[PDB]
Amino acid sequence: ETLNPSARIMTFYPTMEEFRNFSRYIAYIESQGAHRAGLAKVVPPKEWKPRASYDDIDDLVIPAPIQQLVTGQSGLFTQYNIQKKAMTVREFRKIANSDKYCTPRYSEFEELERKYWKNLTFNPPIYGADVNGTLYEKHVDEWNIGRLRTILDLVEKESGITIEGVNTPYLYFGMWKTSFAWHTEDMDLYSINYLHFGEPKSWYSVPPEHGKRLERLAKGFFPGSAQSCEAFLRHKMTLISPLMLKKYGIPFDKVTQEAGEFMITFPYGYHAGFNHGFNCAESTNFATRRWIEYGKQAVLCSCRKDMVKISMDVFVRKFQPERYKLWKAGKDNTVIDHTLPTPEAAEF
């Protein structure tokens, strides 16, 4: 409980030498207590760039843009997705920067944040989300979201299963007021998010050690949804204002991600946020040894069946051989300490 005791969102500025080993640097920031906030920012070296120029993706296709309809009141909302026809990045950007959809004028972030929560349910925006692809140049070896080199790859490499968006990269083309609802990652994995260009992306995060409190709140406020899946928040449709969190004593922090910056989310870190205007982000999941225990206890959506589900078997057999027999029987009653860093952090 001694590292990052206030559990506030931390920001890191790795040197080029520190930057080169991804898994090692994650181990480092966890040794600093970064994981306790559920979310961390990493600012890459000035020298580092994922791609020389972004003026050649104009014809990139967004096959399934989503119009985000939001209904609700008193800081509690549900988001409904309407799939729109395919469109190109040009067409998206022109719509995004049009007077109908562009960022309103404002002075400070808190003003814009207020505008977001006041106008969430009006003028439904369009989000170019979940686009399969990468904007990295193929020769970039540092923090390449396409090939992060973590133990998550045991899913693809050993068992030959590709899960789109999970061990493959996703692109997100945002515009003003496009939202991502409160969620942890599938199987309570880590996620990494790089903002390639454009207006900022703002984030809310709840410390993993208080994630159960957010779940109780959500269940209380959406009792119908709670009855259908135990894990209805995994639907990613649930929006809850910071005013409501504050009212019910749920600790959280806020951070704004700027172009050229990484965000890292940690296992069982609930997060949500919105885009300030036209931008493009790239995202995927990854794992560390610490994640394995979260994966084994992750509570999954029960109402759908096509939901992302990863067999933990290969991970327990490889990294926890001494409890594999116990776990297969279902007698593994390990309790997770959310304040503990990943073992790989010992050297720090």
Ligand SMILES: O=C(O)CCC(=O)C(=O)O
């Ligand atoms: O930018 C977004 O739409 C949300 C990304 C996200 O939830 C993540 O990177 O874990």
Ligand code: NI
């Ligand atoms: Ni996420």
Ligand SMILES: [Zn+2]
């Ligand atoms: Zn469900």
